[PDB]
Amino acid sequence: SPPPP
Amino acid sequence: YLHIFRGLYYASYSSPREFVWCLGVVIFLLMIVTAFIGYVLPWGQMSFWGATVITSLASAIPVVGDTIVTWLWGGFSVDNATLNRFFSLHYLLPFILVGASLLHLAALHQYGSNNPLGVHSEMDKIAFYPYFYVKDLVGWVAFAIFFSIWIFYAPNVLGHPDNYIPANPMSTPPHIVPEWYFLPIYAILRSIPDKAGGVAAIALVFICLLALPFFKSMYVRSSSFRPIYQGMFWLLLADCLLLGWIGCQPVEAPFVTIGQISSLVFFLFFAITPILGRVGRGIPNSYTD
Amino acid sequence: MILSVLSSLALVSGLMVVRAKNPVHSVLFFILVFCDTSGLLLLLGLDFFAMIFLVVYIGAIAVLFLFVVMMFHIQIAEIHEEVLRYLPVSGIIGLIFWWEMFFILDNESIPLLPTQRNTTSLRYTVYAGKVRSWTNLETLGNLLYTYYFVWFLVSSLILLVAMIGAIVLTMHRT
Amino acid sequence: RLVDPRKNFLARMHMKSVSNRLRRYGLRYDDLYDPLYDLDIKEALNRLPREIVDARNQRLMRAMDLSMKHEYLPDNLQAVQTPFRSYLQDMLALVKRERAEREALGALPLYQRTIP
Amino acid sequence: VVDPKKYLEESCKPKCVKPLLEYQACVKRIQGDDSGHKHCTGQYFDYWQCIDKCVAPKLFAKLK
Amino acid sequence: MDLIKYFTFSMIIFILGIWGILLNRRNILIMLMSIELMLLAVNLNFLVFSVSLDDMMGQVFALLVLTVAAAESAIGLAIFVITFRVRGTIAVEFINSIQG
Amino acid sequence: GISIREGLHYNPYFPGGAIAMPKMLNDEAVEYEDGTPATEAQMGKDVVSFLSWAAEPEMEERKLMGFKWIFLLSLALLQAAYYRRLKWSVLKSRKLVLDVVN
Amino acid sequence: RYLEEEDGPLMKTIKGSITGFGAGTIYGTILATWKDVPRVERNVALPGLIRTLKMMGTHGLTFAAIGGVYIGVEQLVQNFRSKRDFYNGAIGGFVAGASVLGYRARSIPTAIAAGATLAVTSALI
Amino acid sequence: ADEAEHGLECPNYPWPHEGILSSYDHASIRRGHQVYQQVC
Amino acid sequence: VKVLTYFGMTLAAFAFWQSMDKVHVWIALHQDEKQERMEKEAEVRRVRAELLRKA
Amino acid sequence: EALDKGAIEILGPYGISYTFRRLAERISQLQSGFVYHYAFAMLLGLTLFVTFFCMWDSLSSWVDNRLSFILIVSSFYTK
Ligand SMILES: CCCCCCCCCCCCCCCCCC(=O)OC[C@H](COP(=O)([O-])OCC(O)COP(=O)([O-])OC[C@@H](COC(=O)CCCCCCCCCCCCCCCCC)OC(=O)CCCCCCCCCCCCCCCCC)OC(=O)CCCCCCCCCCCCCCCCC
Ligand SMILES: CCCCCCCCCCCCCCCCCC(=O)OC[C@H](COP(=O)([O-])OCC(O)COP(=O)([O-])OC[C@@H](COC(=O)CCCCCCCCCCCCCCCCC)OC(=O)CCCCCCCCCCCCCCCCC)OC(=O)CCCCCCCCCCCCCCCCC
Ligand SMILES: CCCCCCCCCCCCCCCCCC(=O)O[C@@H](COC(=O)CCCCCCCCCCCCCCC)COP(=O)(O)OC[C@H](O)CO
Ligand SMILES: CCCCCCCCCCCCCCCCCC(=O)O[C@@H](COC(=O)CCCCCCCCCCCCCCC)COP(=O)(O)OC[C@H](O)CO
Ligand SMILES: CCCCCCCCCCCCCCCCCC(=O)O[C@@H](COC(=O)CCCCCCCCCCCCCCC)COP(=O)(O)OC[C@H](O)CO
Ligand code: HEM
Ligand code: HEM
Ligand SMILES: COC1=C(OC)C(=O)C(C/C=C(\C)CC/C=C(/C)CC/C=C(\C)CC/C=C(\C)CCC=C(C)C)=C(C)C1=O
Ligand SMILES: COC1=C(OC)C(=O)C(C/C=C(\C)CC/C=C(\C)CC/C=C(/C)CC/C=C(\C)CCC=C(C)C)=C(C)C1=O
């Protein structure tokens, strides 16, 4: 999953 | 042509390389004139009749068109004066082409080359020699094989047998066409059922080519990230190939309608690209992460 | 038009035979198909065959099927399957059969196009055959037992085989 | 709105196509914005923090390396990419608003493009 | 002796029966004048295009 | 148009039987029912032809074919019954042990 | 239904079908020094061979040159590909480590 | 014995690609219907249809490739070489078999087998 | 008119000088030259 | 099925049979052209057979 | 080693035995034990019969016999 902003 | 279509696919005409594209357009005009007057020199049937029509093009101007035609001829018809002046021009124009190409290259090195991603490239640049030297050498040898195939085994396939007949000012051949590389312009010319309209469409082709870099566009260059423009690119390529094929056909049904529609599509490319840029300016605000 | 109605009823009822999830329902639709067939037979003037299709197909054969299927108490899990993935294979096989086999008579039996003229007046009547008309029943009975009696008796042998087989395969005497 | 992917399925397919293309290279959509295209982009880039610009330049170098090698990012690095995570559009809009304000009051522009 | 091209042209006819029959039908249909404008050039051309195509691969083998 | 309409009726019945074979891979009772549908369609074909041709042979054979259909259904349902009795189920996975 | 005016001869190959040339390749119109039977087809083929040589007398030299130099240039193309890839391998096989993730 | 045609090598190749897509679609339909459905797909209809259509398309694609490349190479051999025999067409059979069936099979061993087989068939023709 | 204007198309003949390694047939050239000087 | 579903299927089938009627009319109307095509092809085949038998 | 026990064995008894074993293996699997497969085969054979032996009139315009038998064999090399 992409890292949180 | 392959060069111009690389430039169209990667949007190499866009800022800051507008001057590069404009110099290229000037170069294309010089190439066309040079090749045409060169084709007149053998003085075959094709040469004489093509020279007749191209010098006649100036008659589209209402008041001074005839005087320009007769000044270009050096007389009341295409004759020895036309051939002799066309020879001098043919020796001269190649040197102007060399100078224009040098200016083209200098304009391109102002900012450097565009790339297939269309992005800023300052972080990953390498020296021309030897890497792109050896890559261009691969290209040079492949081109040599291609050219040699044409020279040694099919030397006359890209030409018409009519030019092996000496010029006869009395009889126009039943089929009268320029070289293949002029055929799309031929088709655009003949798609207009009007002298002045045809000449104006020929001029409008180069007007659109020159105005292309100055359209307010989106900030994305490469077709690799522009699906709609990419598709429009592959439609324009098909349309240009169709215009070339149509130019080789006699002026009769169904080819008049097909030529008209193809010319319209060709101009629609240049009409639609600015709309695409204006609309796509809003993409980063509408496609949120 | 009437044949369009009966054929539409037969088409829908047959699809229900082959597509109903419950087999008892399939047997009942089968019975509707035989009723429609009997209607067609009445249109052909074959009233004996029209009645016999009711007596034998519905009255005896379908009753046998219903007795057997009802006592089986089939659960749908044992016979369920999705048929969406058969649409293509049925499409080719059906089409090929459709294109060949609904139109096989067209070249041999070309239809008479109905015109805007009364052709009914060109019907020629022979009264000689109308003095003593035969029913379908007596026309069939004139032939079954004398000129084609061997086939009749072989059919009897077939029925005897059915009786023997039914006993030998299923009988469990208390 | 016809550009909104939440309403137009054509816009949704467009966005998905662009996102897949960007993900293959590890690039963000804002990475496609070049400081040589417009002087306003150059100004906005200069106003951003060093860390943002450093990450942009690193992503550009990685993408150029992949492009040179004819290879895409491994699928595991593709799973963690954020193609439309924005860092530039707000700054660029602010820069454009400031330039419009300067022009509306008759002031000289703060920067100009050189004539090529 | 006898020219091989004509002999081959006659021997290639069974491969060109359909254009030949169509040309014959056209000739029959225009045996009436109608101001001398009817003709059978297209059918003639179809028949001879088939005959020439049949003859060409085999002519040069009999020539020296 | 009468004869083409009578023939296509029987023809749709025959095609329906074929489709019932094709669509019922887990349901062999319906497969038997589809076979009866085909037999009914053939019987109808004989009767229609008898009228069209003004000939009695189609009618004699139709009656005999009805006898065959009856015997066929009787024996087939007996075999179904004994298969079910042996297995306790009619599912097709319990009648696939002979193979190769 | 096609008529030809006097002084012209029908020939479907000629555009328009009416040519001012009369038929000249009549059987045995020439005599051959090698005893080749001079049928119309034979003389047609021979005269076309002569005309084709006349139009392109350099053809044999051209084809020999073409075969030789296309073969040599193909070898050169293989060498050029090897050269380019040798010079570029240090770049194409390089391992690049950067801080950035997304 | 063979004078019922109008020919045209480009038409030959195009029509061969179409017959091959005809025959591959039917073949994929038959293959898809013969097989069972996965146990996790017994209660759902759509994915079975999707898989059947995918098999149809894949087999149409590969059979069109064979049916086009075969005639294309066959005609491109009897045009440049300008001869008619079973040798032209055996080369086409070999290249079609090798190329397509080894792209699908992902095995050089199998390509040379498929090309060999396809030649003996065209040769027996 | 329509088709006669362009004429009938010529077939393709297997000329001995056709092929990437095919020469002229020089005896045929000599025979053709005698045909030329005697008829053409 | 629902009773209304059966009725609607029956209506669709009725439409199908009327369409089939139109198809049969079309096929009947084209008997003459098919005969003409058969005759022209028979003439072509007979001419080819007679010509090839000449040799 | 390269010939007698090598190439001649592979394009001979060793290879032949291998292939005919794999093919007998595949043909045996078609006798799947499912009555539905056997009915489907009969339907397919009936459809083939009608298609090839009566509906091959117009076909010949698009179709050739060469391609017919090629695609047949080519089917063996699937999956
Ligand atoms: C102007 C007047 C206005 C006032 C009058 C209005 C009157 C009202 C309208 C009439 C009724 C229409 C509405 C029907 C009921 C809808 C309401 C409802 O609740 O339905 C629930 C229903 C749920 O199903 P269910 O009844 O509860 O049963 C559940 C279980 O299945 C039960 O289990 P089961 O075991 O009993 O059954 C197993 C299986 C049974 O399996 C099946 O039945 C198969 C389903 C697919 C049927 C395929 C076509 C069959 C019809 C034959 C057509 C010709 C075939 C030719 C093929 C051979 C050729 C080779 O179940 C199913 O699969 C159910 C599927 C039902 C879908 C039916 C779709 C029919 C096809 C329609 C095609 C339309 C094309 C039009 C043109 C046609 C070409 C001419 O869902 C639906 O809404 C579908 C029905 C609606 C469509 C069907 C009616 C179509 C009629 C179209 C109008 C006529 C047009 C032509 C006019 C011609 C004029 C000249
Ligand atoms: C000039 C003529 C004028 C005619 C005027 C009349 C026109 C009537 C138009 C009606 C259409 C509009 C309907 C509007 C909606 C009505 C409201 C409503 O539906 O509520 C009703 C409501 C059920 O409605 P629903 O909500 O749709 O529920 C349906 C299922 O529950 C759903 O549950 P499921 O999904 O699980 O389905 C299971 C299945 C149940 O399983 C089944 O198998 C259904 C039964 C089918 C076979 C049963 C008969 C075979 C069994 C042997 C019976 C004895 C045979 C010998 C005696 C009879 C032979 C003459 O249910 C069905 O499939 C029902 C489908 C019905 C198909 C059979 C009826 C059509 C027969 C052909 C009629 C021909 C004329 C009409 C067409 C004209 C041309 C267009 O309750 C009732 O129907 C009352 C029950 C009384 C019905 C009596 C009908 C006659 C029964 C005795 C005769 C049996 C043979 C049939 C005639 C044979 C002729 C030779
Ligand atoms: C991709 C590699 C690098 C780039 C090279 C490009 C090569 C791809 C092909 C490009 C298109 C080639 C030109 C397309 C049209 C040519 C065909 C044509 O116009 O017809 C001519 C015919 O075209 C040819 O003959 C093709 C010749 C190709 C050269 C093949 C000879 C090879 C010699 C060396 C062998 C190389 C082996 C390399 C091994 C490593 C004329 O025919 P003719 O009947 O009038 O004359 C008969 C005589 O044979 C021709 O002179
Ligand atoms: C010479 C001029 C021609 C004139 C043409 C007349 C007017 C038509 C102008 C439109 C151009 C026609 C071609 C446009 C379609 C191109 C094909 C396409 O874009 O489809 C993409 C699919 O996604 C889409 O783009 C569909 C979007 C539909 C349009 C929605 C409009 C809203 C977006 C507006 C943005 C405007 C600016 C966009 C800049 C790109 C491709 O997906 P993919 O390549 O990423 O991967 C899928 C494929 O299977 C594998 O390659
Ligand atoms: C009918 C004539 C046939 C021969 C024609 C001449 C030769 C043509 C070229 C060769 C064709 C066959 C190519 C075979 C390639 C090798 C395939 C292979 O993998 O070999 C296996 C053995 O199979 C063969 O070699 C095939 C033998 C074919 C011999 C002939 C076939 C049967 C012929 C007779 C029946 C048909 C008669 C028709 C008559 C017209 C080895 O098994 P493995 O599992 O150990 O392989 C592992 C692999 O190496 C990777 O590790
Ligand atoms: C005699 C004709 C020409 C010559 C010798 C020439 C030369 C060059 C060279 C050497 C380059 C850099 C390397 C490359 O990109 O390939 C270049 C780039 C370029 N040329 Fe030309 N050119 C010519 C014609 C044209 C024409 C006709 C056009 C357009 C109408 C054009 C537009 C461009 C553009 C836009 C670039 C930038 C490419 C990029 O950065 O991606 N040129 N040219
Ligand atoms: C074997 C001997 C000859 C050969 C090979 C030959 C060749 C040719 C060729 C190639 C043409 C060009 C046709 C065209 O324009 O398409 C031609 C035309 C012509 N030939 Fe000859 N020629 C021969 C003998 C003759 C002779 C003997 C005469 C006169 C007696 C003649 C008179 C003409 C004329 C008048 C034309 C032009 C006809 C027209 O344009 O309508 N030729 N010939
Ligand atoms: C059947 O018809 C046709 C042809 O025929 C076969 C053709 O070929 C072409 C091909 C021509 C094209 C595409 C355009 C040619 C364009 C130009 C601009 C050439 C015109 C220039 C000429 C004649 C020489 C320029 C003269 C100069 C500069 C005078 C010098 C004076 C001073 C230095 C003071 C077309 C369109 C055509 O439709
Ligand atoms: C090992 O991988 C796999 C395959 O590979 C073999 C498969 O495809 C199949 C099985 C699928 C197939 C082959 C369905 C096709 C069946 C047909 C054609 C039914 C016909 C009956 C039989 C037994 C074949 C005999 C038919 C012949 C010889 C043609 C008719 C006869 C004449 C020439 C007149 C499966 C499951 C599979 O997993």
Q: How far apart are CA F23 and CA C14, in angstroms?
A: 13
Q: How far apart are CA B94 and CA B101, in angstroms?
A: 10
Longest Cα–Cα distance of chain D, Å, equals 53
Residue ranges with strand state E in chain B: none
Q: What is the CATH number of the domain that holds F56?
A: 1.10.287.3510
Burial class (CB in 10 A: 0-12, 13-18, 19+), G71: exposed
Q: How many domains does chain D have?
A: 1
Coil, strand, or helix at residue G22?
coil
Strands G18-19 and G9-10, sheet pairing: antiparallel
Q: How far apart are CA H65 and CA E19, in angstroms?
A: 34
Catalytic residue among B77, B79, B135, B224: B135
The sign of the dihedral angle between the CA atoms of F82, F88, F90, F95 is: negative
Q: How far apart are CA K5 and CA B52, in angstroms?
A: 80
Q: How far apart are CA K74 and CA K79, in angstroms?
A: 11
Burial class (CB in 10 A: 0-12, 13-18, 19+), H106: exposed
CA of F22 to the centre of ligand 5 (A): 39
Q: Are I30 and G44 in contact (CB under 8 A)?
A: no
Distance from CA of B288 to the nearest CA of D (A): 6
DSSP label of B44: B
Question: Taking CB atoms and an 8 Å limit, are B145 and G84 in contact across chains?
Answer: no
Domain that holds residue C85: 2-169
The angle, 0 to 180 degrees and rounded to 10, between the axes of the packed helices E4-11 and G40-55 is 110
Q: How far apart are CA D90 and CA A4, in angstroms?
A: 20
Q: Are G78 and B138 in contact (CB under 8 A)?
A: no
Q: How far apart are CA J49 and CA E20, in angstroms?
A: 13
Q: What residues pair up with G10 in beta bridges, in sequence order?
A: G18
Residue F96 counted as domain residue? no
Residue F92 counted as domain residue? no
Which tokens sit at H81?
């070489």
Q: Are H31 and H62 in contact (CB under 8 A)?
A: no
Query: Among C158, B267, C86, C11, which Cα is nearest to H49's?
Result: C86
Burial B194-217 (b: 16+ CB within 10 A, else e): eeeebbebbeebeebbeebbeeeb
Q: How many domains does chain C have?
A: 1
Domain that holds residue E2: 1-64
The sign of the dihedral angle between the CA atoms of H27, H33, H37, H42 is: positive
Q: How far apart are CA E52 and CA G36, in angstroms?
A: 24
The reply to whether I9 touches chain E by the CB within 8 Å rule is yes
DSSP E27-53: HHHHSS-TTTT---HHHHHHHHHHHHH
Give the mutation target among D1, D14, D18 for probing the ligand 4 site: most ligand atoms within 8 A of CB. D14
Query: Among B33, B70, B20, which Cα is nearest to B212's?
Result: B20
The ligand with the least distance to the CA atom of B276 is 4
Residue C23 counted as domain residue? yes
Residue F94 counted as domain residue? no
Question: From residue I6, how far is each of B175, B222, G14, I3, J32 by CA, in Å?
Answer: 10, 48, 8, 6, 37
Q: How far apart are CA C37 and CA B193, in angstroms?
A: 70
B252 is catalytic: no
Q: Which residue has the tokens 């027996």?
A: H124
**Whose CA is closest to atom 2 on ligand 7?**
I40
- For residue G21, say whether it is annotated as part of any ligand binding site: yes
| Long-range contacts, B274-282 (Cβ 8 Å, 24+) | B274/B215, B274/B216, B274/B217, B276/B217, B276/B218, B276/B228, B276/B229, B276/B232, B277/B215, B277/B216, B277/B217, B277/B218, B278/B216, B278/B218, B279/D3, B280/B218, B280/B220, B280/B226, B280/B228, B281/B218, B281/B219, B282/D3
Q: How far apart are CA H32 and CA H26, in angstroms?
A: 10
Letter for the amino acid at C4? S
Please state the three-class secondary structure of B212-236 as a single string.
HHHCCCCCCCCHHHCHHHHHHHHHH
Q: How far apart are CA C140 and CA I22, in angstroms?
A: 86
DSSP label of G10: E
Q: Are G70 and B149 in contact (CB under 8 A)?
A: yes
Burial class (CB in 10 A: 0-12, 13-18, 19+), B163: buried
Question: From residue B127, how far is each of B108, D19, G47 by CA, in Å?
Answer: 16, 32, 61
Question: Taking CB atoms and an 8 Å limit, are G46 and I35 in contact across chains?
Answer: yes
Query: Among B198, H34, H14, which Cα is nearest to C88's?
Result: H34
> Does the C-beta of B36 come closer than 6 Å to ligand 8?
yes
Q: Which residue has the tokens 């061997």?
A: C150
Which tokens sit at F76?
């087939």
Which tokens sit at C159?
């029925």
Q: Are B30 and B97 in contact (CB under 8 A)?
A: yes
User: How many Å separate Cα B153 from the centre of its chain?
Assistant: 27
Distance from CA of D108 to the nearest CA of B (A): 22
- For residue B160, say whether it is annotated as part of any ligand binding site: no
Q: How far apart are CA B265 and CA H41, in angstroms?
A: 49
**Residue C75: how many CB atoms within 10 A of its CB?**
11
Chains G and I touch (3+ CB pairs under 8 A): yes
Q: Are B203 and B29 in contact (CB under 8 A)?
A: no
Q: How many domains does chain B have?
A: 1
DSSP label of D70: T
Q: Are E62 and E27 in contact (CB under 8 A)?
A: no
Question: From residue B212, how far is each of B117, B223, B226, B264, C165 by CA, in Å?
Answer: 20, 16, 17, 17, 91
CA of B56 to the centre of ligand 8 (A): 9
Q: How many domains does chain E have?
A: 1
The reply to whether F29 touches chain C by the CB within 8 Å rule is yes
